[PDB]
Design a protein around this ligand. Structure first.
Ligand SMILES: O=C(Nc1ccccc1F)[C@H](C1CCCCC1)n1c(-c2ccc(Cl)cc2)nc2cc(F)c(F)cc21
Lengths: 13, 230
C-alpha cells in the first residue's frame, strides 16, 4: 500500500 | 509579552523532543575529517535522510494533539513536511559556529559532494538567508513544529483541526521573536517568510537527488515513500 512504512511508524508504540 | 507557564512547559517539551536528533557536530565532523567521492557522499546522504525521517516521525508524534488528528491527515502532514524539515535541519547545522575556516571547508565539501550546480545556488542561498536570522535552538525547534503542522498541505481533509494545533506554536514563536530580537520587529515575519522559500525544495527534490553525479541512485524503502523516487 502507499506510505506503508510511514503508516507503520505512525501507528506503532 | 512574556511566555505563560503553559507556554514555557510547551517550549521545554518541544525542545526535549527536538534534541533527540543526531548532533550537528557529529555530522560536520565527518564532512570536515576527509573528502569523500560523489558515490560515498550519496550513501552518506541516504543514511542521514533515513535516520532524519525516523526521528522526525517520533518528534511529530509528540507534538501536542498530533495523535488526535485523522490518520490520513497525519500521513499527509508527515509526507508534506519531511523534505522541508531536512533542509531546515541542514540549514541549522550549516549555520552553527565552527573554528576559523571550518565553515568555508564545510561549504566547499558540500559544493563538491556530487549535487548539480543548479541546485547548489538555491540551497546555499537558503542556508545563508536562514543564517542572517541568527535563530536560537528554540526558534529552530518551534519553526520545525510549525512546518510539520501546516494546515495548507495537499490532501489535508480537516484544515481547521491542524490550524488549532499550529496556532499555539506560532504564538510561542512570536513571543520568542519579540524577546530574542526586540530591536527587530520584522523578525517574526522574516522567519515565516523563509518558510515560503523552504517550500521550493519540494518541487525539485526528486531532480536534485536523481541528478547527483553517481551511476546508480539507490534509495531505502522508507525514503522511497517520503521522496518522489524509484
Ligand atoms: O547529510 C546531509 N544533510 C542532512 C540530512 C538530514 C539531517 C541533517 C542533515 F544535515 C547533507 C550532506 C550529505 C553528504 C554530502 C554533503 C551534504 N547536507 C545537505 C544536503 C541536504 C540535502 C541535499 Cl539533496 C543535499 C545536501 N546540506 C547540508 C548542510 C550541512 F551543514 C551539513 F552538515 C550537511 C548537509
Amino acid at each position: 500500500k502507499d506510505h506503508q512504512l510511514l503508516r507503520y511508524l505512525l501507528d506503532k508504540d | 509579552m512574556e511566555l505563560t507557564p503553559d507556554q514555557q512547559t510547551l517550549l521545554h517539551f518541544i525542545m526535549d523532543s527536538y534534541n533527540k536528533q543526531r548532533m550537528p557536530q557529529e555530522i560536520t565532523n565527518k564532512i570536515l575529517k576527509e573528502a569523500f567521492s560523489a558515490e560515498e557522499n550519496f550513501l552518506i546522504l541516504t543514511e542521514m535522510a533515513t535516520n532524519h525521517v525516523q526521528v522526525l516521525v517520533e518528534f511529530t508524534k509528540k507534538l501536542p494533539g498530533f495523535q488526535t488528528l485523522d490518520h490520513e491527515d497525519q500521513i499527509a502532514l508527515l509526507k508534506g513536511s519531511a523534505v522541508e524539515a531536512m533542509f531546515l535541519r541542514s540549514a541549522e547545522i550549516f549555520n552553527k559556529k565552527l573554528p576559523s575556516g571550518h565553515s568555508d571547508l564545510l561549504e566547499a565539501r558540500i559544493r563538491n559532494s556530487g549535487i548539480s550546480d543548479e541546485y547548489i545556488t538555491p540551497m546555499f542561498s537558503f542556508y545563508k538567508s536562514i543564517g542572517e536570522l541568527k535563530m536560537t535552538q528554540e526558534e529552530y525547534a518551534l519553526l520545525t513544529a510549525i512546518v510539520i503542522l501546516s494546515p495548507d498541505r495537499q490532501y489535508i481533509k480537516d484544515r481547521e483541526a491542524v490550524e488549532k494545533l499550529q496556532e499555539p506554536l506560532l504564538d510561542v514563536l512570536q513571543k520568542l521573536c519579540k524577546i530574542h530580537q526586540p530591536e527587530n520587529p520584522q523578525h517574526f515575519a522574516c522567519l515565516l517568510g523563509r518558510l515560503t522559500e523552504l517550500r521550493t525544495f519540494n518541487h525539485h527534490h526528486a531532480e536534485m537527488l536523481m541528478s547527483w553525479r553517481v551511476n546508480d541512485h539507490k534509495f531505502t524503502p522508507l525514503l522511497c515513500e517520503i521522496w518522489d523516487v524509484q
